Amino acid sequence: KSMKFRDGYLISTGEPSKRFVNTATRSAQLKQGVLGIKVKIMLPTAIDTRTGLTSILPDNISVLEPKT
Amino acid sequence: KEESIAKMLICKVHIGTKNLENKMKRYVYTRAKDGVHIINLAKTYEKLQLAARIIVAISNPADVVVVSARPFGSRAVLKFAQYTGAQAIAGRWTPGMLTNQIIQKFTEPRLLIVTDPRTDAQSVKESAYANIPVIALCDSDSPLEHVDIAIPCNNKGKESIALMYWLLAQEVLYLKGVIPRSEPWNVMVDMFLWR
């Protein structure tokens, strides 16, 4: 059986899923068999980009407050 | 007072309809030959005065909500909230305002005025969840569930709604020291009329 633990926000599709997500896989050998360990960590959204520069916002289109 | 009844006679506040709805029998004077029920108009004035006293007893006017659902009652409710210090809704009611604390427009009052209990039924339904003294403005076929003080009127005429709200506001101003009696209110009806 497989057990899934999640917390927060994650992305699965597209190019941003390859940049902003970190992945690792390992296995542990018990006396009854072998167990698979899979970890996926979504980094803080900076992930330096094609033009070497931090892409702080992947898709958000925030609007600036007009100067008083 | 004579002239208030005169103005109520000029407008059509005294004509109801069929569907007597027996809990409203004691406010109806008679039935005409075409089947229309007539409202006494001597009890309307007295109930209006008592309603004004109940309203003025509130400490800050912001703890009062006045609601209208129909298009030709929006001007009257907005003006009444302007000259008093209450809050108005005037249209579509969000079904969780009085009972859902996480929502954006919680706005829990201490008293609530209704234009018509048959169309503002969601508002009166939610009042009984938070101990709110509903006061309404009932026609000859209105339901009286969860209604405490009922003013006999007709909810259908634009002139009727404008006149009744104007009278209530003027009386509220008299009970405060803003202007004394024997001097009429300087603002005029047709400021509360629709369109």
Binding site: - | R53, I54, P133, P143, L175
Partner: protein, 81 residues
């Protein structure tokens, strides 16, 4: 209740409906309290008021208006019941 030493042993005393004497409990949310302002022979509202309590039962049955009318007519606030 008082014990044998005349010490009150209730944690609180609930209210009663003015129309039926019905002893409103702590979760009844259809119960309301009304304050009616007073005038001072000149038509302006002084600091005084009168209080009534109405239970959720009669308020759900749709009879709060008639009971309130009678209760106010007793207190010299109306001319009919």
């Amino acid at each position: 209740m008082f014990n044998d030493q005349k010490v009150l042993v209730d944690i609180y005393i609930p209210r009663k409906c003015s129309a039926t004497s019905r002893l409103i409990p702590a979760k009844e949310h259809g119960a309301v309290q009304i304050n009616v302002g007073m005038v001072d022979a000149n038509g302006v509202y002084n600091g005084k008021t009168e209080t009534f309590a109405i239970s959720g039962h009669v308020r759900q049955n749709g009879e709060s208006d008639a009971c309130l009318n009678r209760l106010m007519y007793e207190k010299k606030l109306l001319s009919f019941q």
